[PDB]
Amino acid sequence: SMSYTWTGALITPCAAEESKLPINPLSNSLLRHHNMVYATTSRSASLRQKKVTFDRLQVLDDHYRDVLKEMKAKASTVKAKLLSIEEACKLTPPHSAKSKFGYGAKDVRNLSSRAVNHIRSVWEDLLEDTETPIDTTIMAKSEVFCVQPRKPARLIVFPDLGVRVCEKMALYDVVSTLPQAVMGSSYGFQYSPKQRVEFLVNTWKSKKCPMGFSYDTRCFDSTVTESDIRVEESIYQCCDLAPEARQAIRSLTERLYIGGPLTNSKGQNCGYRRCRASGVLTTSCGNTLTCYLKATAACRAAKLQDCTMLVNGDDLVVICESAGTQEDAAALRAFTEAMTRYSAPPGDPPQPEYDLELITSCSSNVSVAHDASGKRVYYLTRDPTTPLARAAWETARHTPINSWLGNIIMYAPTLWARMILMTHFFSILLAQEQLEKALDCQIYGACYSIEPLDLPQIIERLHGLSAFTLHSYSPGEINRVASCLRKLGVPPLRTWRHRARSVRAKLLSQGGRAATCGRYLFNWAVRTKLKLTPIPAASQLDLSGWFVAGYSGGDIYHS
Ligand SMILES: Cc1ccc(S(=O)(=O)Nc2ccc(Oc3ccc(C(=O)O)cc3)cc2C(=O)O)cc1
Ligand SMILES: [Mg+2]
Numbered sequence: 196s197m198s199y200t201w202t203g204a205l206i207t208p209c210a211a212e213e214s215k216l217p218i219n220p221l222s223n224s225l226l227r228h229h230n231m232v233y234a235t236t237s238r239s240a241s242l243r244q245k246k247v248t249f250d251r252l253q254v255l256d257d258h259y260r261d262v263l264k265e266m267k268a269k270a271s272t273v274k275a276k277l278l279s280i281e282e283a284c285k286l287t288p289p290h291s292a293k294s295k296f297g298y299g300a301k302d303v304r305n306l307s308s309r310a311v312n313h314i315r316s317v318w319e320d321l322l323e324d325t326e327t328p329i330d331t332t333i334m335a336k337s338e339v340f341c342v343q344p345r346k347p348a349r350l351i352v353f354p355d356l357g358v359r360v361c362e363k364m365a366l367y368d369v370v371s372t373l374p375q376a377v378m379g380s381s382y383g384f385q386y387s388p389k390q391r392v393e394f395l396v397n398t399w400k401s402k403k404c405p406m407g408f409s410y411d412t413r414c415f416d417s418t419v420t421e422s423d424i425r426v427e428e429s430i431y432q433c434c435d436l437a438p439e440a441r442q443a444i445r446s447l448t449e450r451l452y453i454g455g456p457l458t459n460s461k462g463q464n465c466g467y468r469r470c471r472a473s474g475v476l477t478t479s480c481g482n483t484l485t486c487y488l489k490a491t492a493a494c495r496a497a498k499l500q501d502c503t504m505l506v507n508g509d510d511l512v513v514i515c516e517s518a519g520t521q522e523d524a525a526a527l528r529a530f531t532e533a534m535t536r537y538s539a540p541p542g543d544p545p546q547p548e549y550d551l552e553l554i555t556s557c558s559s560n561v562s563v564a565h566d567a568s569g570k571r572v573y574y575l576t577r578d579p580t581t582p583l584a585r586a587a588w589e590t591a592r593h594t595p596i597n598s599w600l601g602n603i604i605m606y607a608p609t610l611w612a613r614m615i616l617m618t619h620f621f622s623i624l625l626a627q628e629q630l631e632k633a634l635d636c637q638i639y640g641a642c643y644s645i646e647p648l649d650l651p652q653i654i655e656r657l658h659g660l661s662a663f664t665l666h667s668y669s670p671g672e673i674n675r676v677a678s679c680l681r682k683l684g685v686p687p688l689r690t691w692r693h694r695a696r697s698v699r700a701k702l703l704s705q706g707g708r709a710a711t712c713g714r715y716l717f718n719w720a721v722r723t724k725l726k727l728t729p730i731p732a733a734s735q736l737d738l739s740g741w742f743v744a745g746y747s748g749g750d751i752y753h754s
Pocket of ligand 1: 235380610613614664666667668669673677680686687688689719
């Protein structure tokens with residue numbers, strides 16, 4: 196069927212939309228070619244609609260059914276709990292989109308009577324009505340990028356706040372534990388960056404002759420069929436569930452997940468969706484299961500040998516035993532035709548890779564550097580263009596979510612995160628006296644509130660002390676960074692080193708945690724290297740829930 200149907204009403208913004216990076220003294224200090232940075236707006240929605248609107252072709256075979264059963268066998272071992280209204284409310288980010296029924300995220304978090312009572316009526320409605328398509332809002336997403344040698348806006352679709360809290364009640368526990376139970380080590384979100392690198396590196400070295408490839412599905416959400424979503428529900432249904440949770444899942448599947456009506460911000464009927472909605476709780480888990488199911492079966496169809504996969508939502512990376520250059524290229528092509536029949540045609544043409552550093556997955560790649568001892572150390576990195584562009588935008592404009600903070604956290608060991616992001620934001624924060632103010636950022640889609648001053652302990656725990664001593668990065672990595680800086684008009688190494696020494700001096704003079712940030716985060720900026728010993732606070736850190744599951748588009752806040 197058609198992924199989308201349109202009435203002709205426009206996808207409208209609900210306020211003024213900024214498209215250009217402001218000329219700001221602070222941001223200009225980070226990136227000078229401000230004209231290369233732009234934010235997508237509803238003005239390009241029409242372009243996106245065209246690309247995501249098409250008929251889906253799907254042919255299921257024995258391999259598909261075989262794998263599905265294997266997956267359900269594992270799902271069968273799970274017992275999901277069903278969250279209380281209060282537990283669900285507490286999972287709503289403070290900046291979550293308000294309800295059209297007289298209450299916002301704040302009322303939900305504070306368990307206001309109007310919010311809880313409306314939430315209860317919505318739940319009761321899910322138990323009683325198994326057919327009525329739930330309404331959803333379609334909006335053009337506002338994201339920042341750097342121009343290329345421009346991307347149209349992504350379209351997000353999400354139900355009312357009341358429904359969102361109900362989703363949490365019925366499926367939060369499911370989407371948090373089912374993926375790992377069914378997919379085991381193949382489930383990417385259970386890994387921290389370091390553990391992802393470890394898994395990838397060990398898998399790679401475990402092959403006699405490794406061959407790997409990332410597989411990019413063209414607009415994955417739109418390729419998801421009604422069949423796919425019901426297959427997804429069938430897996431969820433193998434879980435031991437509370438009666439009400441079971442009905443809620445059945446109802447949400449038919450009324451929301453398989454599709455439904457689209458309404459713009461002006462309240463006008465916009466069209467109909469028959470594919471994955473980007474803004475529901477099951478999107479990450481659902482996409483991961485779907486991608487995993489299709490790929491695993493595609494692998495069997497292509498006769499790839501000793502396949503080891505890593506799936507993060509619609510992101511897939513496979514590492515196998517090579518059968519030789521020619522055979523590999525043919526097998527990859529067969530794999531692709533298999534995925535195509537399953538309704539997951541390729542966007543960028545997949546290509547086999549024989550150098551692990553050249554494989555980009557989850558927008559990142561593995562690279563190696565050296566610690567102070569001179570020992571090789573693997574770590575996760577990525578082209579810094581987008582991170583830097585967004586860092587600039589966030590410097591000039593206040594944003595609910597600070598991607599720079601998440602990038603410092605997730606890419607702490609990288610040359611660019613340390614040289615530029617750390618230096619830039621700490622100098623600004625120290626100057627504005629806000630080192631103590633907690634800020635929100637996202638990790639695998641979930642929102643977290645973090646204190647910049649705790650960064651040293653966080654980095655030590657997630658990446659190890661070596662994150663503060665890496666040097667001698669790869670020529671490929673160094674060149675990518677340097678070319679990025681020239682492209683965006685970002686100051687050179689020497690400028691950042693000078694700025695870094697300057698902030699480090701100040702951080703040290705403040706004592707306490709600031710001093711710790713100065714010693715560990717910027718030891719790279721000085722010749723007189725301080726001794727970096729284990730930070731006591733890094734022992735009493737509970738960072739386990741950070742890497743349990745993916746929640747992008749799931750409106751999740753972890754506290
Ligand atoms: C966190 C960090 C760690 C070590 C150093 S270093 O000064 O000890 N060595 C390097 C300094 C710059 C660099 O990569 C660049 C970056 C920018 C430019 C440039 O501005 O053109 C040139 C080389 C790579 C390395 C290395 O150890 O491999 C600087 C920053
Ligand atoms: Mg894709």
